[PDB]
Symmetry: C2
Subunit: 320 residues, 2 copies
């Protein structure tokens, strides 16, 4: 009886996506079958990786399909349930975003505890970005308490959580950003020891070296290029670099010299820690030690706009 507006891929984007590549459409709200649930979406997320999912190139993740509604992180509320394992009214996180309604088996919908924070934060700080930060910091880098931490693109969704998690563990934290406003935010809101503007600081190797008088223990990577060169130059013996984001560095020999470890990782391989993640992330949000910024568009029709604009980007669909 109801309608669900969704954003479908109208045409494969070439290079950068155009607004003409997206199509707003009206779809049916299928009533749930046995073991299934129907959920009305409230918040949805737009993330950078989605761009790669719109290309036809060989990818580790299946691309989107022309004519099919796009997919992405979303927070909804269960409004109908024919499954005993998930009751009506539960707030759930899922991957069927870019739409107003979603029907499917209850397994595909993960309940989110709103005690820990606002439900939309389950797409950012309490979601995949915050979990990427936490996994890279503690499961890849093995950050011991009190170590020094260098974070590139520290004002981003992942870098901010990395910075504040390291600060919460007694770490000397230096972050990198592309503007003085982001550096002021990093130093005064995020509360890191020093923020470097890689556009104005001159030689970035020298800037990082001066920022770390005793070297770097952990390097969280989101940019690359000369940032990795500077980090390796300033890294301490047994320093670990968790690479999450990305002319290569000219000082690779030091990896052998200081016994450096450089590990790429994907957050998907660490969901088995989600509980533990929450166990740390909940309190530190309530204490005010974990802060974040949001940029919220309104209406399903503005879902493409938000995506084209790549604070953590979200789109509000339904009411709470």
């Amino acid at each position: 009886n109801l309608s669900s507006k969704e954003i479908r891929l109208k045409a494969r984007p070439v290079g950068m996506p155009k607004d003409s590549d997206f199509e707003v459409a009206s779809a049916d709200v299928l009533q749930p079958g046995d073991g299934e649930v129907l959920v009305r979406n409230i918040w949805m997320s737009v993330d950078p990786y989605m761009r790669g999912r719109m290309m036809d190139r060989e990818s580790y993740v299946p691309p989107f399909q022309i004519g099919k509604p796009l997919e992405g992180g979303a927070i909804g509320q269960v409004v109908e349930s024919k499954s005993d394992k998930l009751k009506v009214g539960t707030y759930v996180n899922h991957m069927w975003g870019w739409r107003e309604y979603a029907t499917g088996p209850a397994a595909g919908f993960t309940p989110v505890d709103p005690s820990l924070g606002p439900i939309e934060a389950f797409l950012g700080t309490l979601g995949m970005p915050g979990m990427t930060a936490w996994a890279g910091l503690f499961k890849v880098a093995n950050l011991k308490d009190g170590e020094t931490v260098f974070v590139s693109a520290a004002s981003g969704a992942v870098g901010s959580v990395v910075c504040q998690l390291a600060k919460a563990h007694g770490c000397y934290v230096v972050g990198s950003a592309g503007s003085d406003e982001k550096c002021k935010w990093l130093e005064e809101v995020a509360g890191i020891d020093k923020a470097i503007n890689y556009k104005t600081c001159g030689d970035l190797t020298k800037a990082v070296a001066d920022a770390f008088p005793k070297g770097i223990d952990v390097y969280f990577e989101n940019v690359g290029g000369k940032h990795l060169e500077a980090a390796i130059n300033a890294m301490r013996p047994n320093g670990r670099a968790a690479l999450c984001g990305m002319p290569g560095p000219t000082n690779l020999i030091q990896i052998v010299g200081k016994s450096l470890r450089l590990q790429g990782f994907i957050v998907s391989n660490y969901f088995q820690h989600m509980g533990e993640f929450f166990a740390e992330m909940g309190p530190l949000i309530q204490s005010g030690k974990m802060k974040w910024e949001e940029t919220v568009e309104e209406g399903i029709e503005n879902a493409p706009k938000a995506f084209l604009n790549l604070g953590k980007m979200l789109v509000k669909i339904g009411p709470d």
Copy 2:
């Protein structure tokens, strides 16, 4: 009561080391004090890293000293002992080479079990090169049986042991070398699946890709440069690189781990190491080449021959059985 010939550093080398930088001299054989031992040296090793120890540059290892006898891996036999923890007659590994006699506290002398193999192999296959290989393969790269292995500079002291250790664990092994003779040796003696000549093979990325139809699981590094690029290009998801480029992004894509290491941080595994290295030598699955010069006076010669074929360079000093 006796005299001991020694090789001392007469001058720091300028550029490449010269024969004029070394000095043969006669030193005293100090009788051991309490808790000390006097050992007659039988075998001594010369290695490339020793060159770095001859310069005054900032190094992770203290350089040699002018007027002081050089130091390096050596296998000797205890001929006098005033320590209960080390008995006379024991064959010992230590770092006071380039000389015929060594006197010092028993702690600095590690006994070597000749069951596992010839005592001189405790300077190569059963020594720091073989243990570096073993630690990088199993403690750093965590090589699971059946995985694919790419080894650079595979004809070297470390790479050969890496190749044969991986072969012993059922691994498809491709190695790189700088000459056709080294490649033939890798394929026929070491018994690896394919050897690539990085000086002649043209595009090394393409050669490595063609050598690995299903990709690389473990990459052991001994050279660097384009070898790491080729490895990263041909590495599989969750590939590990033990280290002894324009495609770094793939590290994020395939969840690659790149770890440098020094063997010093893994001595706590040596026991396990021996438990594996002994049998694989007796089975004939672990082979190596040696180049043995004779006499302490030929110790500089041997060292200078490390930069002018191949094989582990050694020089015999004392008799096989001193007591």
